[PDB]
Design an enzyme around this catalytic site. Structure first.
Site, PDB file in Angstrom:
ATOM      1  N   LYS A   1       0.916 -23.906  11.703  1.00 34.41           N
ATOM      2  CA  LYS A   1      -0.302 -23.842  10.899  1.00 34.41           C
ATOM      3  C   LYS A   1      -1.487 -23.511  11.789  1.00 34.41           C
ATOM      4  O   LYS A   1      -1.502 -23.883  12.968  1.00 34.41           O
ATOM      5  CB  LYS A   1      -0.527 -25.163  10.182  1.00 34.41           C
ATOM      6  CG  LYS A   1      -1.400 -25.044   8.965  1.00 34.41           C
ATOM      7  CD  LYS A   1      -0.687 -24.333   7.865  1.00 34.41           C
ATOM      8  CE  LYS A   1      -1.513 -24.320   6.607  1.00 34.41           C
ATOM      9  NZ  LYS A   1      -0.880 -23.540   5.523  1.00 34.41           N
TER      10      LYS A   1
ATOM     11  N   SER B   1      10.638   0.415   1.901  1.00 29.82           N
ATOM     12  CA  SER B   1      10.226  -0.210   0.665  1.00 29.82           C
ATOM     13  C   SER B   1      11.484  -0.281  -0.154  1.00 29.82           C
ATOM     14  O   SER B   1      12.216   0.690  -0.230  1.00 29.82           O
ATOM     15  CB  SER B   1       9.221   0.692  -0.038  1.00 29.82           C
ATOM     16  OG  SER B   1       9.279   2.033   0.476  1.00 29.82           O
TER      17      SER B   1
ATOM     18  N   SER C   1       0.073 -13.414  -6.025  1.00 31.55           N
ATOM     19  CA  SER C   1       0.480 -14.269  -7.129  1.00 31.55           C
ATOM     20  C   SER C   1       1.663 -15.174  -6.791  1.00 31.55           C
ATOM     21  O   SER C   1       1.949 -16.122  -7.515  1.00 31.55           O
ATOM     22  CB  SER C   1       0.858 -13.414  -8.326  1.00 31.55           C
ATOM     23  OG  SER C   1       1.965 -12.578  -7.982  1.00 31.55           O
TER      24      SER C   1
ATOM     25  N   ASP D   1      15.170 -22.936   1.817  1.00 29.18           N
ATOM     26  CA  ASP D   1      15.995 -22.060   2.611  1.00 29.18           C
ATOM     27  C   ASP D   1      15.400 -20.804   3.168  1.00 29.18           C
ATOM     28  O   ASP D   1      16.053 -19.770   3.147  1.00 29.18           O
ATOM     29  CB  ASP D   1      17.264 -21.743   1.848  1.00 29.18           C
ATOM     30  CG  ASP D   1      18.126 -22.962   1.706  1.00 29.18           C
ATOM     31  OD1 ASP D   1      17.861 -23.932   2.426  1.00 29.18           O
ATOM     32  OD2 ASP D   1      19.076 -23.027   0.905  1.00 29.18           O
TER      33      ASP D   1
HETATM   34  N1  LIG Z   1       3.214   1.363  10.709  1.00 32.56           N
HETATM   35  C1  LIG Z   1       2.406   0.880   9.638  1.00 32.56           C
HETATM   36  O1  LIG Z   1       1.150   0.702   9.655  1.00 32.56           O
HETATM   37  C2  LIG Z   1       3.223   0.577   8.329  1.00 32.56           C
HETATM   38  C3  LIG Z   1       2.539   0.077   7.201  1.00 32.56           C
HETATM   39  C4  LIG Z   1       3.353  -0.214   6.081  1.00 32.56           C
HETATM   40  C5  LIG Z   1       4.730  -0.054   6.056  1.00 32.56           C
HETATM   41  N2  LIG Z   1       5.257   0.430   7.265  1.00 32.56           N
HETATM   42  C6  LIG Z   1       6.696   0.598   7.324  1.00 32.56           C
HETATM   43  O2  LIG Z   1       7.175   0.969   6.052  1.00 32.56           O
HETATM   44  C7  LIG Z   1       8.141  -0.003   5.572  1.00 32.56           C
HETATM   45  C8  LIG Z   1       7.764  -0.458   4.135  1.00 32.56           C
HETATM   46  O3  LIG Z   1       6.547   0.291   3.732  1.00 32.56           O
HETATM   47  P1  LIG Z   1       6.891   1.757   3.093  1.00 32.56           P
HETATM   48  O4  LIG Z   1       5.737   2.521   3.252  1.00 32.56           O
HETATM   49  O5  LIG Z   1       8.258   2.227   3.610  1.00 32.56           O
HETATM   50  O6  LIG Z   1       6.988   1.437   1.442  1.00 32.56           O
HETATM   51  P2  LIG Z   1       6.311   1.676   0.061  1.00 32.56           P
HETATM   52  O7  LIG Z   1       6.898   3.004  -0.570  1.00 32.56           O
HETATM   53  O8  LIG Z   1       6.352   0.185  -0.813  1.00 32.56           O
HETATM   54  O9  LIG Z   1       4.942   1.964   0.454  1.00 32.56           O
HETATM   55  C9  LIG Z   1       3.984   2.195  -0.568  1.00 32.56           C
HETATM   56  C10 LIG Z   1       2.824   3.145  -0.227  1.00 32.56           C
HETATM   57  O10 LIG Z   1       2.938   3.891   1.058  1.00 32.56           O
HETATM   58  C11 LIG Z   1       2.840   5.268   0.683  1.00 32.56           C
HETATM   59  N3  LIG Z   1       3.423   5.911   1.912  1.00 32.56           N
HETATM   60  C12 LIG Z   1       4.718   5.993   2.392  1.00 32.56           C
HETATM   61  N4  LIG Z   1       4.809   6.658   3.534  1.00 32.56           N
HETATM   62  C13 LIG Z   1       3.524   7.013   3.841  1.00 32.56           C
HETATM   63  C14 LIG Z   1       2.927   7.760   4.968  1.00 32.56           C
HETATM   64  N5  LIG Z   1       3.643   8.249   5.912  1.00 32.56           N
HETATM   65  N6  LIG Z   1       1.611   7.918   4.929  1.00 32.56           N
HETATM   66  C15 LIG Z   1       0.782   7.479   4.008  1.00 32.56           C
HETATM   67  N7  LIG Z   1       1.244   6.760   2.899  1.00 32.56           N
HETATM   68  C16 LIG Z   1       2.644   6.569   2.878  1.00 32.56           C
HETATM   69  C17 LIG Z   1       3.455   5.475  -0.723  1.00 32.56           C
HETATM   70  O11 LIG Z   1       3.087   6.768  -1.249  1.00 32.56           O
HETATM   71  C18 LIG Z   1       2.744   4.255  -1.317  1.00 32.56           C
HETATM   72  O12 LIG Z   1       1.378   4.549  -1.708  1.00 32.56           O
HETATM   73  C19 LIG Z   1       8.250  -1.075   6.628  1.00 32.56           C
HETATM   74  O13 LIG Z   1       9.644  -1.110   7.017  1.00 32.56           O
HETATM   75  C20 LIG Z   1       7.350  -0.682   7.865  1.00 32.56           C
HETATM   76  O14 LIG Z   1       8.036  -0.381   9.146  1.00 32.56           O
HETATM   77  C21 LIG Z   1       4.544   0.748   8.374  1.00 32.56           C
HETATM   78  N1  LIG Z   2      -2.500 -19.157  -0.617  1.00 37.51           N
HETATM   79  C1  LIG Z   2      -1.166 -19.481  -0.413  1.00 37.51           C
HETATM   80  O1  LIG Z   2      -0.265 -18.689  -0.234  1.00 37.51           O
HETATM   81  C2  LIG Z   2      -0.792 -20.986  -0.406  1.00 37.51           C
HETATM   82  C3  LIG Z   2       0.564 -21.327  -0.201  1.00 37.51           C
HETATM   83  C4  LIG Z   2       0.866 -22.726  -0.228  1.00 37.51           C
HETATM   84  C5  LIG Z   2      -0.059 -23.740  -0.428  1.00 37.51           C
HETATM   85  N2  LIG Z   2      -1.382 -23.253  -0.624  1.00 37.51           N
HETATM   86  C6  LIG Z   2      -2.437 -24.374  -0.814  1.00 37.51           C
HETATM   87  O2  LIG Z   2      -3.301 -24.089  -1.913  1.00 37.51           O
HETATM   88  C7  LIG Z   2      -4.559 -24.745  -1.659  1.00 37.51           C
HETATM   89  C8  LIG Z   2      -5.714 -23.799  -1.942  1.00 37.51           C
HETATM   90  O3  LIG Z   2      -5.177 -22.509  -2.449  1.00 37.51           O
HETATM   91  P1  LIG Z   2      -5.582 -21.249  -1.547  1.00 37.51           P
HETATM   92  O4  LIG Z   2      -5.980 -21.874  -0.304  1.00 37.51           O
HETATM   93  O5  LIG Z   2      -4.419 -20.315  -1.665  1.00 37.51           O
HETATM   94  O6  LIG Z   2      -6.921 -20.586  -2.265  1.00 37.51           O
HETATM   95  P2  LIG Z   2      -8.406 -20.442  -1.978  1.00 37.51           P
HETATM   96  O7  LIG Z   2      -8.689 -20.431  -0.310  1.00 37.51           O
HETATM   97  O8  LIG Z   2      -9.026 -19.352  -2.941  1.00 37.51           O
HETATM   98  O9  LIG Z   2      -8.631 -21.828  -2.413  1.00 37.51           O
HETATM   99  C9  LIG Z   2      -9.856 -22.468  -2.400  1.00 37.51           C
HETATM  100  C10 LIG Z   2     -10.323 -22.600  -3.862  1.00 37.51           C
HETATM  101  O10 LIG Z   2     -10.481 -24.043  -4.104  1.00 37.51           O
HETATM  102  C11 LIG Z   2     -11.929 -24.259  -4.346  1.00 37.51           C
HETATM  103  N3  LIG Z   2     -12.063 -25.579  -3.744  1.00 37.51           N
HETATM  104  C12 LIG Z   2     -11.939 -25.959  -2.415  1.00 37.51           C
HETATM  105  N4  LIG Z   2     -12.073 -27.265  -2.216  1.00 37.51           N
HETATM  106  C13 LIG Z   2     -12.318 -27.742  -3.488  1.00 37.51           C
HETATM  107  C14 LIG Z   2     -12.529 -29.048  -3.953  1.00 37.51           C
HETATM  108  N5  LIG Z   2     -12.508 -30.085  -3.133  1.00 37.51           N
HETATM  109  N6  LIG Z   2     -12.734 -29.149  -5.287  1.00 37.51           N
HETATM  110  C15 LIG Z   2     -12.752 -28.210  -6.199  1.00 37.51           C
HETATM  111  N7  LIG Z   2     -12.548 -26.901  -5.846  1.00 37.51           N
HETATM  112  C16 LIG Z   2     -12.325 -26.743  -4.438  1.00 37.51           C
HETATM  113  C17 LIG Z   2     -12.714 -23.118  -3.686  1.00 37.51           C
HETATM  114  O11 LIG Z   2     -14.049 -23.060  -4.168  1.00 37.51           O
HETATM  115  C18 LIG Z   2     -11.776 -22.012  -4.079  1.00 37.51           C
HETATM  116  O12 LIG Z   2     -11.986 -21.546  -5.455  1.00 37.51           O
HETATM  117  C19 LIG Z   2      -4.430 -25.357  -0.328  1.00 37.51           C
HETATM  118  O13 LIG Z   2      -3.939 -26.719  -0.527  1.00 37.51           O
HETATM  119  C20 LIG Z   2      -3.345 -24.573   0.392  1.00 37.51           C
HETATM  120  O14 LIG Z   2      -2.654 -25.309   1.433  1.00 37.51           O
HETATM  121  C21 LIG Z   2      -1.743 -21.892  -0.609  1.00 37.51           C
HETATM  122  O1  LIG Z   3       4.617 -18.653   4.641  1.00 39.66           O
HETATM  123  C1  LIG Z   3       3.472 -18.135   4.295  1.00 39.66           C
HETATM  124  O2  LIG Z   3       3.260 -16.937   4.317  1.00 39.66           O
HETATM  125  C2  LIG Z   3       2.398 -19.094   3.885  1.00 39.66           C
HETATM  126  C3  LIG Z   3       2.698 -20.566   3.909  1.00 39.66           C
HETATM  127  C4  LIG Z   3       1.609 -21.555   3.477  1.00 39.66           C
HETATM  128  O3  LIG Z   3       0.508 -21.750   3.969  1.00 39.66           O
HETATM  129  C5  LIG Z   3       1.927 -22.490   2.233  1.00 39.66           C
HETATM  130  O4  LIG Z   3       3.072 -22.293   1.738  1.00 39.66           O
HETATM  131  O5  LIG Z   3       0.970 -23.256   1.995  1.00 39.66           O
END
Ligand SMILES: NC(=O)c1ccc[n+]([C@@H]2O[C@H](COP(=O)([O-])OP(=O)(O)OC[C@H]3O[C@@H](n4cnc5c(N)ncnc54)[C@H](O)[C@@H]3O)[C@@H](O)[C@H]2O)c1
Ligand SMILES: NC(=O)c1ccc[n+]([C@@H]2O[C@H](COP(=O)([O-])OP(=O)(O)OC[C@H]3O[C@@H](n4cnc5c(N)ncnc54)[C@H](O)[C@@H]3O)[C@@H](O)[C@H]2O)c1
Ligand SMILES: O=C(O)CCC(=O)C(=O)O
Ligand SMILES: NC(=O)c1ccc[n+]([C@@H]2O[C@H](COP(=O)([O-])OP(=O)(O)OC[C@H]3O[C@@H](n4cnc5c(N)ncnc54)[C@H](O)[C@@H]3O)[C@@H](O)[C@H]2O)c1
Ligand SMILES: NC(=O)c1ccc[n+]([C@@H]2O[C@H](COP(=O)([O-])OP(=O)(O)OC[C@H]3O[C@@H](n4cnc5c(N)ncnc54)[C@H](O)[C@@H]3O)[C@@H](O)[C@H]2O)c1
Ligand SMILES: NC(=O)c1ccc[n+]([C@@H]2O[C@H](COP(=O)([O-])OP(=O)(O)OC[C@H]3O[C@@H](n4cnc5c(N)ncnc54)[C@H](O)[C@@H]3O)[C@@H](O)[C@H]2O)c1
Ligand SMILES: NC(=O)c1ccc[n+]([C@@H]2O[C@H](COP(=O)([O-])OP(=O)(O)OC[C@H]3O[C@@H](n4cnc5c(N)ncnc54)[C@H](O)[C@@H]3O)[C@@H](O)[C@H]2O)c1
Ligand SMILES: O=C(O)CCC(=O)C(=O)O
Ligand SMILES: O=C(O)CCC(=O)C(=O)O
Lengths: 501, 501, 125, 501
Positions: B126, B393, B213, B119
Site C-alpha cells: 500500500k 487486447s 467500475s 485468488d
Molecule cells: N507501449 C505502450 O505504451 C502500450 C500501451 C497500451 C498497450 N500496449 C500493449 O498492447 C497490449 C494491449 O493493448 P492493445 O493496444 O494491444 O489493445 P486494444 O486493441 O484494447 O487497444 C485499444 C486501442 O489502441 C488502439 N491501437 C492499437 N495499436 C495502436 C498503435 N500502434 N497506435 C495507436 N493506437 C493503437 C486501438 O485502435 C484502440 O483505440 C499490451 O500487451 C501492451 O504490451 C502498449
Molecule cells: N478505487 C478502488 O479501486 C478501491 C478498491 C478497493 C477499496 N477501495 C476503498 O474505497 C474507499 C474510497 O473509494 P475510492 O477511494 O475508490 O474513491 P474516491 O478517492 O473518489 O473516494 C473518496 C470519496 O469519498 C468522499 N469522502 C471521503 N471521506 C469521506 C467521509 N469521511 N465522509 C463522507 N464522504 C467522504 C470524497 O469526498 C469522495 O467523494 C476507500 O476505503 C478505499 O480503500 C477502493
Molecule cells: O489491486 C489494485 O489494483 C487495487 C487494490 C486496492 O487498493 C483495493 O482493493 O482497495
C-alpha cells in the site's frame, strides 16, 4: 525515562539544527546572490533548510530467522538514509532493543551534519536491528546480520555507492565482517568495490588500522583542541592540559574504553566508570588496561579489584570531564544542574538534551558537541572506504622509492657541504634524527590514519571556534557547529537546483 | 475520532487475522504432517502465523517539490509491502492528509489477505502520500506523483515484478498514467513489461475496460451472492433480491458511485448518499447518473435538486444495506448499535471496528468483509497486469477464426440434420439466437473482465460460506474469510521452508 | 545438475542449507534463472528442493524478475507448481508404451498381443 | 611421462599445501581464541583448511570457431577460480594441448597461495584453452581468444571485479590486447574499469612498463635474496653472489629469457639453455641478447652460432642454478638425483615433484618455491590493475610539483648555511648528486614497478626465512612458504564466519 524532559530524539536533533539555522539564515540569504529577489532570497534560504531537516528514505524491515531452538522469530530492522547531498550515506548499525524508527532517524541526521562538520563526503544514514545481542547465540546473530544485510541490499540500503553501514552500539568488526561477506558473495559478486559496502570491518577483511580506537582517539583530540585553549578553559575556570585533569566515562564500550585509554595516556585521571549494570570510582584513578582486562574476563567491570562499587549517577560524578559513551539523552534537565564536570565530552550520540544544554550554558559548562567530538569514527571509516577503493595498503608501492630518494636527498646536502668545506670538512655525515629515521620510508596506513584524523579533528575544531566567536556563542560550541554543518549542507543543496521538482 | 474505540489500524486488521487464526490453528497443525513432532506441529503452525502478520518492507520517503508559487515543500510518502509469498505485491496509492505508516501498513496487509481470498497471486502492499489533493494545483500533483514514482522506483517499491501500485483515495487513472510514464521513461526504458508497473491506468495508456467500475461491480456481486441465499437473508429477516431492497452509501467516490450505479441497476433503492462535506436522502430514491452529473458540475452533491440535505449520520440511515465507501473505521462501537441496516457492504477498507463487529453480530447484522467485498478492484487490476504482460487486447487474434469456425460448427449440425431428413427437411436453417449471436466471435476484453470478475467473486463467496458453516460463524463472514486468507497464505509459507534463516 | 551427496546422511536441514547454497552458487555464474537454465527434479530431489531453490533464487537475484519463480520447475503447487508434474514422467512412460504396445505390427514382431490388459511388467527403482 | 612419479597436478599442489598445514595447524588452533572450545579449535582449524584446498568455481567451455579453411572446429577451454577470500581472482591463460581441468585447477591454486605469500590481494584462478598455437593462423587465434573472452565473460569468469586473466604459456600482450578489446567493447562498454579485466596487456592498451620482464626480474630478485645470505649458501657449500656463479635455464620463453637476461646482467654465467625442441651449452657462456636475437629470426635457438647443440637433460646440466622455465613436473624423482645444480630457481609453476623435493632435500639442494619465485608476474600485474583503476600513469600529476618543491628544499638548507657562514661561506651551492638528480622529479611508472617489485620480493623472502627458521625447515623453503600462504589465507576465512552455510 526523564519524565518531563524525555524528548523525541528526531525533533531534538532537528531543533539543534534549527538554532544554528537562526544564527545563519541571514548570511545564507546574504551570500546568496540570485538576481531577481528581495528577501525572496530568505524564503529560498527558508525552503532549503526545510528540505534539509527530514530523512530522504527510511526502510523498515521485519524478517524471520529460525532461533537455534527450532522457533521461528520475526525481527525488526530499520535503515534511515537521511541525506544524499553527498552520496555514500554513512552510519552505524545499532543492535539494541531501544532502536526505533525515530531513534534511527535522528542518529541518521546526526551522521549527515557530523560528516559536514568534519568534511567527510557522505550523507548521513543509520541502521537499527531491535534485538538484545545478549539473548541470541553467537550464531543467531550471524543469521540475523547476514539476513539483515540481504534485506537492506535488495532495497538500496547498503552498497559501496548508496549507503555504507559501520559499527555502533552492540555491533563491531565481527558483524561488519558478516555484512561484507554476504554482500560481496551476493550482490557485489561482480562489484570491484564489493567490500567497501561496509566499514569498521576486521583487518583481515579489509579493515584499516585505528578504526577500533578511532572514535576514542577522536574524542581525545576533540578535547585537547579545546582543553588547551586557555581562553575557553579560563571561562571554565580551569587550567590547560589533561595532565592535571580528571574525568569519568559513562559506558565502557568502544568509544568509552578507548576514550579513557587516550586521555589516561595524556596524564588525565579517570576517577570513575559507568556501565549498563554498574559504577566504579577509585579516586586514585583506574587503569584503562587493568579495567579492560577485568571486563574481558568478567563480562563486567563490577567488582574491579581496585575500585569500590560506586552507587550514584556516574554522570553526577565529580570530575573535570564527563564523557557520555552510551545510549542517548542521559544529561537531561533533571540531572544537568548537578553533573559537576567542567567539560562534557559528548562521545555518545545525542547525550545532552536541549534543556540540559541550557542549564550547562547557565552553570557555564562546555559540552563539546557529539556532532564534532565523535566524528573520529566516520573519519577513520572514511579512510577505510578510501582504502578499499584504492585497493592498496598505504605505502606498499612507495616505501622503497621513498626511502632511497630520501637518503639521496640528505646525501646531496652532505656532498654539497663537503665539496665546499673540502678536506677539513672531510666528512660531514648527514644522518636522519631518530624521529626522521622512523619516517624515512614515508607514512604507512597507521601514519595516515593517525596523522590524518589528527589534522581533520584539529581543523574542524578551529572551524567551530571561529564560528563560536563570530557569533558570541561562547561556550555554546554546538550551535556554532550546526552553523557550519548547515552552510556546507546548504551550499550543496542550493547549488544543485535543489530537486528535479 | 471515536474516543474510546479509535484503534490502531494495523493492530486492528492484525487482530481480525488472529481470530481466524484461532478457528484454524488446529487444522493447520492437523493437515501439517511433518514427521518428527507432536504439537511441535503447533509451535511451527504458531511461528508461521507470527511471521505472516507483520509487513516485510516499509519505505518512508520525504522529498521536495517546488510549489507553483516558488516555495519549496518537503512531502511525506510511504509504501508498505506487506508480503511476498506471492511476488508482485499490489495495493493502491492513497492521497490524503490522513495517511501514516500504520494506516498504510494495515491497508497493505488487507491487500495480501484480500488477494488470498479472491485468488489473485499478489502479495499485499500500500502507498500513501500525505497531501490533500485539493490544495495543490493539477500541476503540483503531477510533480508530486512523478517524483514519488521516481523515489519508490529507486528503492524497490514499484516495478512490474516487485510492487505494482494502483488507485485508492484521491488517486485515479490520471496519476496511474503519470506513474507509468515516468517509470517507463526512466527505469523501465528497456523493460518489456515497463507499463505493468502500475494498474488502474487509462485505456490509452494500457488500461482495461471495467477497472473504474470494477470495485463497485465487485461490491455489487459481493452483495448478490449473499443477498440471494435465503438462508442468510432469513437470519437477516429479509427477502431475497435487491429489487425490493434499499441502501445508503457513504462517500460518493470511485467505489461509492459505481456501487450505487450497479445496485440501482438491479432494482435496489438508494435512499441516501454521504459525502466528506454532506448528506442527501430522497426516500423516493436518488438516481446514480443524475447525482453523478450534479457532482460533476458542482464538485459536490450538496444541494442536489432532488433530495433534501440530510443531517445526521449517513451510516445511521434507515436502509437495508449500508455501503461504507470512504475512510476507514467509521462504524465504531459508538454508532454500531444504531446503524439500522441489515447488510453492511464493506466497500471501503477496514470501515468496521472489532467492537462494532461484535455489536453487529449481537444486533444480528451481516457485514460482508471488505476483505472479500472490495476484491473487485484487485481482480480487474490483475486482469490489467495480465493484459499488459500478454501485449494483446483480448480477442484481436481470434475473433475471426472464432466466428468462422462457429458458423461452420452450426452448419455441421444443419447439414447433419438435412442429410437425414432430406428434402422434406429440405432446409433446416440453424441460426445462433440473439444471445449467441452477440457471442459468436468469442469473448472480448470487456467480456473477460466482467464474466471473469463475476466468476471470481461468486467463487470466493461460496468459499466464504462453506467456511462460515464448517465453523458456525453464521453471520460472522469476516473471520470465515480470514480462515481462508490464512491457510492459503499459510500453505505458501510453510511449503517454502519459511525463510533462509 | 548434480550435487555429490547421499541425501540419507544429511539431516533435512543440512539439505536445505546445501540446496539453498547450491542455488546461490549456480545463480552467480549463469547456471540458473528463468532465461538461461531452469533446473528440475531427478534422483533424490523433488518438489521440496525445487521449492527451496525457487525461494532463494526469487528472494535473491530474481527479486525484481517478473519471472523470478520460473527459474525452476517441478516445484510444489503452493509455490507455483502445476498439477501432474509428480506423475508426469510416469504417465509419460505409460503413454510411451501404449503408443507402441497397441500397434500390432510392432507387438507382432514382439510375438505378443496388443494391450496392457493381458500384459505383465517389473519396474526397477 | 615420469612412469612411477607423474602425479595428479592438483593433488600434488594440494599435498604441498598439506605439509605446511602440518607445521602450522597447532598455532592456528593456538592463536585461535574462540571461547567455548577445547581442541574444538583444532577441528575448526581443521575444517577451514579443508574448505581452502578445493577450487570454488571451475568453468569448462567448448565452442566453435570456423578455421580459416572453412572447417568448423569445436574448442576446449577452462577457467578455474580457486578462491575468493580476496576477490579479483588472478591467473594466466595457458594455450597448450596439455591443458586440462586438473592442470588448470592446480595452476589456479598455485595462484591463490602465491599471491598470499607476496601480499597481492587476489584469489587464485587459471585459464586454459586446449590448442597448440603453432597450428592455427594468427587470425584463427584472434577468433579463438576473442570468442573465449566472450564465453568466460557471460558466466562470471572474467571482469575487473571477479576474475582478471593474464599471460602464461603461449599467450602474451597480444592475446591480452584481444581479450581486453572484446571485453571492453562488449560487457564492459559502460564499465569505468572496462580495461582492468585483464593484465599483461600492451602499453598502448593500458599496460605497465616491466610486465614482460616482471617474472624474470622477480626470479632474479628471488634468487639474490637467497644467493646472498651466506648462511643458506653455506649449507649450499657455495659462495655469495651471481658474479661467480653459473646457471642453465629450461624453456627460453617469457620467464625463461628474461630470467637469463637479469642473472647475466649480475655477473652470473648462463652455460646452457633448454627448448621444447632442443638444448644448447657454451661453457664460455651464452649471451641473452645474442641468443634472443637468433631465436627471434630463427623461431629457434637450435644451431646458435656460438654453442654446440647439447644433447642430454637440460635439467641435468652442471651449473650452480637450474631455472625451470616451462611445463610443470620436470624435476621428478627419476632425475632429481642427478640435477647437479645447487639452487633450483622454480620460475615455472610446479616444476618439482614431492618425491624430487625429498631427494633435493637429501642431496641437500635448495629449491626456491615457484610459490614465491615467480610471484614477480602477479606483483607487476597487480601494479597494472592498480594503474588501470587509478586512470593515471604514475607521476604525470606530480613530477613538476615534486621537482620544484625538491629544489626549494635544497635551496632552504643552502640559504640556511649561507645565512650563518655569511660572506665567507658566500656561496655554498647545494646540488643534487647524479643519482638524486635522476630522482628529483620523483618516481615514474618504471620506478614504482621496479622499486616496488624489489621491495615485495625481498620482503616475502625474509618472510619465508623467518618461517624456515622458526620451524627448522632449513633448505625446505617451500613448506615454510606454504606455512605463510596458509595463515593469511586462513586468517581471512576464519574471520569471515567462513560461509553463509
Ligand atoms: N507501449 C505502450 O505504451 C502500450 C500501451 C497500451 C498497450 N500496449 C500493449 O498492447 C497490449 C494491449 O493493448 P492493445 O493496444 O494491444 O489493445 P486494444 O486493441 O484494447 O487497444 C485499444 C486501442 O489502441 C488502439 N491501437 C492499437 N495499436 C495502436 C498503435 N500502434 N497506435 C495507436 N493506437 C493503437 C486501438 O485502435 C484502440 O483505440 C499490451 O500487451 C501492451 O504490451 C502498449
Ligand atoms: N478505487 C478502488 O479501486 C478501491 C478498491 C478497493 C477499496 N477501495 C476503498 O474505497 C474507499 C474510497 O473509494 P475510492 O477511494 O475508490 O474513491 P474516491 O478517492 O473518489 O473516494 C473518496 C470519496 O469519498 C468522499 N469522502 C471521503 N471521506 C469521506 C467521509 N469521511 N465522509 C463522507 N464522504 C467522504 C470524497 O469526498 C469522495 O467523494 C476507500 O476505503 C478505499 O480503500 C477502493
Ligand atoms: O489491486 C489494485 O489494483 C487495487 C487494490 C486496492 O487498493 C483495493 O482493493 O482497495
Ligand atoms: N563505535 C563507534 O565507532 C562510534 C562512533 C560514534 C559514536 N559512537 C557512540 O558511542 C556510544 C556507545 O559506544 P559504542 O556503541 O561504540 O560501544 P559499545 O556498543 O561497546 O557500547 C556499549 C557500552 O556501553 C555500556 N552501556 C550501554 N548502555 C549503558 C548505560 N545506559 N549505562 C551504562 N553503561 C551502558 C555497555 O554495557 C557497553 O559497555 C553510542 O552513543 C554510539 O552512537 C560510536
Ligand atoms: N577482496 C578482499 O576480500 C580484500 C580484503 C582486504 C583488502 N582487499 C584489497 O586490498 C586493498 C587493501 O588491503 P591490502 O591487503 O592491499 O593491504 P595490507 O598490506 O594493509 O593488508 C594487510 C594483510 O593482508 C596480507 N595480504 C596481502 N595480500 C594478501 C593475499 N593475497 N592473501 C592473503 N593475505 C594477503 C598481508 O600479509 C597482511 O597480513 C584494498 O584496496 C582491497 O581491494 C581485498
Ligand atoms: N609469463 C608470466 O608472467 C609467468 C608468470 C609466472 C609463472 N610463469 C611460468 O613460466 C613458464 C613458462 O614461461 P612463459 O609461459 O611465461 O613463456 P613462454 O609461453 O614463452 O614459455 C614457453 C617457452 O618454453 C619453451 N618450452 C615449452 N615446453 C618446453 C619443454 N618441455 N622443454 C623445453 N622448452 C619448452 C617454448 O618453446 C617457449 O620458448 C610456465 O611454467 C608458466 O606457468 C609465467
Ligand atoms: N580507455 C583505454 O583504452 C585506456 C588505455 C590505456 C590507459 N587508459 C587509462 O589511462 C590510465 C593509464 O594510462 P595513461 O595513458 O594515463 O598513461 P601513460 O602516460 O603511461 O600512457 C602512455 C602512452 O599514452 C599516450 N597517451 C595518453 N593519453 C593519450 C590519448 N588521449 N590518446 C592517445 N595517446 C595517449 C602517451 O603519449 C603515451 O604514448 C588508466 O588509468 C586508464 O583508465 C585507458
Ligand atoms: O562512519 C562510520 O563508520 C560510523 C559512524 C557512527 O556511527 C558515529 O560516528 O557514531
Ligand atoms: O597475475 C598475473 O598477471 C599472472 C600470474 C601467473 O600466471 C604466474 O604468476 O604464473
Amino acid at each position: 525515562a526523564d519524565r518531563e524532559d524525555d524528548p523525541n530524539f528526531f525533533k531534538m536533533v532537528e531543533g539543534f539544527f534549527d538554532r544554528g539555522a537562526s544564527i545563519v539564515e541571514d548570511k545564507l540569504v546574504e551570500d546568496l546572490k540570485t538576481r531577481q529577489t528581495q528577501e525572496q532570497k530568505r524564503n529560498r534560504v527558508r525552503g532549503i533548510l526545510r528540505i534539509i531537516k527530514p530523512c530522504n528514505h527510511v526502510l523498515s524491515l521485519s524478517f524471520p530467522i529460525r532461533r537455534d531452538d527450532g522457533s521461528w522469530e520475526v525481527i525488526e530492522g530499520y535503515r534511515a538514509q537521511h541525506s544524499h547531498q553527498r552520496t555514500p550515506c554513512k552510519g552505524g548499525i545499532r543492535y539494541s532493543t531501544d532502536v526505533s524508527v525515530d531513534e534511527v532517524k535522528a542518529l541518521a541526521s546526526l551522521m549527515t551534519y557530523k560528516c559536514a562538520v568534519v568534511d567527510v563526503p557522505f550523507g548521513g544514514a543509520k541502521a537499527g536491528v531491535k534485538i538484545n545481542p545478549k539473548n541470541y547465540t553467537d550464531e543467531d546473530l550471524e543469521k540475523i546480520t547476514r539476513r539483515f544485510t540481504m534485506e537492506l541490499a535488495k532495497k538500496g540500503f547498503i552498497g559501496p555507492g548508496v549507503d555504507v553501514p559501520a559499527p555502533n552500539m552492540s555491533t563491531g568488526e565481527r558483524e561488519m565482517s558478516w555484512i561484507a561477506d554476504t554482500y560481496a558473495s551476493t550482490i557485489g559478486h561482480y562489484d570491484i568495490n564489493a567490500h567497501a559496502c561496509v566499514t569498521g570491518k576486521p583487518i583481515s577483511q579489509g579493515g584499516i588500522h585505528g578504526r577500533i580506537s578511532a572514535t576514542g582517539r577522536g574524542v581525545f583530540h576533540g578535547i585537547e583542541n579545546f582543553i588547551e585553549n586557555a581562553s575557553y578553559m579560563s571561562i571554565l575556570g580551569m587550567t590547560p592540559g589533561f595532565g592535571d585533569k580528571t574525568f569519568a566515562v559513562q559506558g565502557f564500550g568502544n568509544v568509552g574504553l578507548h576514550s579513557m585509554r587516550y586521555l589516561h595516556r595524556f596524564g588525565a585521571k579517570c576517577v570513575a566508570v559507568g556501565e549498563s549494570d554498574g559504577s566504579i570510582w577509585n579516586p586514585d584513578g583506574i587503569d584503562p588496561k587493568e579495567l579492560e582486562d577485568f571486563k574481558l574476563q568478567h563480562g563486567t567491570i563490577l567488582g574491579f579489584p581496585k575500585a569500590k562499587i560506586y552507587e550514584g549517577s556516574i554522570l553526577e560524578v565529580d570530575c573535570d570531564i564527563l564523557i557520555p559513551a552510551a545510549s542517548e539523552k542521559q544529561l537531561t534537565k533533571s540531572n544537568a544542574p548537578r553533573v559537576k564536570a567542567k567539560i562534557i565530552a559528548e562521545g555518545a550520540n545525542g547525550p545532552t538534551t536541549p534543556q540540559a544544554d541550557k542549564i550547562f550554558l547557565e552553570r557555564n559548562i562546555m559540552v563539546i558537541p557529539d556532532l564534532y567530538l565523535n566524528a573520529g569514527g566516520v573519519t577513520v571509516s572514511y579512510f577505510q572506504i578510501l582504502k578499499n577503493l584504492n585497493h592498496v595498503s598505504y605505502g606498499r608501492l612507495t616505501f622503497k622509492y621513498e626511502r632511497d630518494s630520501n637518503y639521496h636527498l640528505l646525501m646531496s646536502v652532505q656532498e654539497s657541504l663537503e665539496r665546499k668545506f673540502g678536506k677539513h670538512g672531510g666528512t660531514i655525515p648527514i644522518v636522519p634524527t631518530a624521529e626522521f629515521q622512523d619516517r624515512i620510508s614515508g607514512a604507512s596506513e597507521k601514519d595516515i590514519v593517525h596523522s590524518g584524523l589528527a589534522y581533520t579533528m584539529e581543523r574542524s575544531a578551529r572551524q567551530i571556534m571561529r564560528t563560536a566567536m563570530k557569533y558570541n556563542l561562547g561556550l555554546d560550541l554546538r550551535t556554532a557547529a550546526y552553523v557550519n554543518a548547515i552552510e556546507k549542507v546548504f551550499r550543496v543543496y542550493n547549488e544543485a537546483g535543489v530537486t528535479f521538482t
